[PDB]
Ligand binder design. Structure first.
Ligand SMILES: Nc1nc2c(ncn2[C@@H]2O[C@H](CO)[C@@H](O)[C@H]2O)c(=O)[nH]1
Ligand SMILES: Nc1nc2c(ncn2[C@@H]2O[C@H](CO)[C@@H](O)[C@H]2O)c(=O)[nH]1
Ligand SMILES: [Zn+2]
Ligand SMILES: [Zn+2]
Lengths: 161, 157
């Protein structure tokens, strides 16, 4: 059920992170968008491949899912992010109308290997103007440990962008 | 020079509304008074809810200059950038933002109450360093007028 599906899709997002950093497409971040347990898009960060600083894993997955589904609203879909989404990605998640976000690692795990200290107030509940009502789940247990370890494991395979 | 490029971003907003590409928003990225990108919202054309004017402009500028950072460049936005767009402006390292209309002008004709704390100075976890100018006088009047003039010329998203 939900738990098994959640763990499977977060694991897919983590594997995308490893795949993308391995082939030089971008940093170690993956995202999977699912429609009633059917995968619509499975993507990783493409900033280096695309020369596009907006091509984070989550944005790339939204772009792909919307193109595939022929609609700009992903209201029947959920997104699994290997790492907590940044302010841009969390904004994109809002604009796409995704109904639920599950993420694996806290942003601090990426910041620990040198990524920008760039965290979404609306995800953490700390804004004045931007407020979220999106359903948000932070992974726990085995899936969370596997997600957090990505950054220490991939430190030397890529250069920070 | 600020009025010229703000006015070009507003012209883009009108053109994109007129051809059905997206909503009434445009953005212009410049390097030392040379236009590097001139775009409008492409959400409807591209079937892409991330294709706001500012994101589109960033993608096109990064392609034109063949690099992922625009630290020598400034962005002119016909309307206050949203949390997504202002985050993209942060990631692209643009050094200055000039924007025409406050978000309230767009909210007034039906867009989401969807405002970037970091732009307004109320971020906790997100703190901006880039220089931000809200237009005044004629530039503000032109930019606010977009929303009254385009009111029912496009589909909301
Ligand atoms: N979750 C995620 N974070 C990214 C990505 N690319 C860069 N980062 C950075 O990693 C940190 C944690 O999200 C922030 O500085 C992000 O901007 C991406 O594709 N996905
Ligand atoms: N500045 C700007 N706002 C947009 C655009 N598309 C939709 N909006 C919405 O307009 C409001 C003010 O930025 C927010 O709800 C935005 O999400 C765009 O392309 N540019
Ligand atoms: Zn991001
Ligand atoms: Zn925007």
């Amino acid at each position: 059920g939900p738990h098994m599906s959640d763990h499977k899709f977060l694991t897919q997002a983590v594997e995308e992170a490893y795949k993308g950093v391995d082939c030089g497409d971008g940093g170690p971040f993956g995202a999977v968008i699912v429609h009633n347990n059917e995968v619509v898009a499975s993507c990783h960060n493409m900033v280096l491949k695309y020369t596009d600083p907006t091509a984070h894993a989550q944005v790339t997955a939204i772009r792909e899912a919307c193109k595939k589904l022929n609609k700009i609203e992903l209201s029947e879909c959920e997104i699994y992010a290997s790492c907590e989404p940044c302010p841009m990605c969390f904004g994109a998640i809002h604009l796409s109308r995704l109904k639920r976000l599950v993420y694996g690692a806290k942003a601090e795990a990426a910041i620990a290997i040198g990524f920008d200290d760039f965290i979404a107030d609306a995800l953490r509940g700390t804004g004045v103007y931007q407020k979220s009502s999106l359903e948000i789940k932070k992974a726990d247990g085995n899936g969370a440990a596997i997600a957090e370890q990505v950054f220490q494991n991939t430190k030397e395979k890529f250069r920070l962008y």
